[PDB]
Amino acid sequence: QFRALLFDVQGTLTDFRSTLIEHGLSILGDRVDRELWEELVDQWRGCYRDELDSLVKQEKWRSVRAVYRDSLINLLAKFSDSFCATSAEVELLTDGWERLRSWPDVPSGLEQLRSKYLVAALTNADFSAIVNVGRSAKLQWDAVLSAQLFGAYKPHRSTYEGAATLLGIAPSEILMVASHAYDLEAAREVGAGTAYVRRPLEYGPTGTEDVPDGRFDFLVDSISELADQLGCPR
Amino acid sequence: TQFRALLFDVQGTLTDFRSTLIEHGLSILGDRVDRELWEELVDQWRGCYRDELDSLVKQEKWRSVRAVYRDSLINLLAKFSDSFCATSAEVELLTDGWERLRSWPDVPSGLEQLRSKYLVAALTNADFSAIVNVGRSAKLQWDAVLSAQLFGAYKPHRSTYEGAATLLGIAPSEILMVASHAYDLEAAREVGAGTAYVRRPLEYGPTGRTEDVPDGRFDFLVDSISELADQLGCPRLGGTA
């Protein structure tokens, strides 16, 4: 039995790619075509994950807003022949990562879980970003937790252990929920349960992690489906 | 248009802790204690907790507030040992009462009304797991939950308000602090926060002491969270917002 479900948010609960594609196209207009902007959004995510990987190996923490801003600036330099952005527009574009929309039925699935479980976010985004994403993605939590609180990013073990300490529960009483296998594996190393949510469109229409039945404790296509499997009414 | 977030004290400001713990203890202990006596211990319990936090603030130390509550209960049990007794298991159950606080009437809907215009967050000296639990017992839904435990310091230490502003990504002058205790508003304002005082005449019981708070001492002076929401121009619940 679990007392709390701890959720990855970007991708797991939110369509960040669609959000940032539409966000950037609305700000930039016909300065960019959809095909170019789609490619930059994919490279932007790659630079962010590359930087976080490097910071984790050094056991260091930076503002993730700064990570997104700096990588955008460097990508603008790479694509400078095709379009340009002002400094004010860099800030507005970077804001898009704090306006993520949820996958359909995520708000109702989250609400369904709360009859039996505490639900909390554990995200690498800054604390203020996940508060903002709560409004744009319509997510209501018992608690919001960020890498900023621990000075370390997932998958560092101090994030899961810090979350368990703050929540007053043992790591084995937390069910970690994510669409990324690395996160579940890291949480399980300290004892957490694991629930994998398939998100086939997380990275666009491309053709997926190798996740057979049994690799994780639960393997589902929606949060509502997980709530059903955990015995949550409705 | 001035504020981006409201930051709330919780115990007393939003919750009737005195009624909660009076009824909680009488249900655990039953006939072993009379209402008149248990009420007295509840008031003394709160006093010991406040005294211990005041001492830790001066030492700039932090410890689990559940432990503060538990240790002071054990010392009050010794003091009243001729009238009743409690097991170690019952000490844990009684100490749980501070995590089961019930809200004042209309607090949940006042809080929901504010969210049409503002981010709302708790800033409490209770441990993080305690305020999460109080959210269920008091029916409070937040944008964020913040605890002294995150900062290693209790209110009114400057680092709690500044830490909260840093985490929320907003300047202190864009935070409106909400409390029924003048000392909390005064400390938040020293960092730049706006101030909203909520009168709670029953916070300390039917004959509860009150503070001298005239018009103008704080930015807002109200009798309910819903009244505050109206003065900030939040639409009534049930509309498009």
From TrEMBL, chain A:
Per the record, the coiled-coil ranges are: none
SUPFAM superfamilies for the chain? HAD-like
Q: What is this protein called?
A: Epoxide hydrolase
Tell me one GO molecular function of this protein: hydrolase activity, acting on acid halide bonds, in C-halide compounds
Q: Which UniProt keywords apply?
A: Hydrolase
Q: Which organism is it from?
A: Rhodococcus opacus
Q: Which domain of life is it from?
A: Bacteria
Q: Does the keyword Repressor apply?
A: no
- Gene3D superfamilies attached here? 1.10.150.750, HAD superfamily/HAD-like
Pfam hit, one: Hydrolase
* Gene giving rise to this polypeptide: eph
The record's NCBIfam families line, in alphabetical order, gives:
HAD-SF-IA-v2 (TIGR01493), HAD_type_II (TIGR01428)
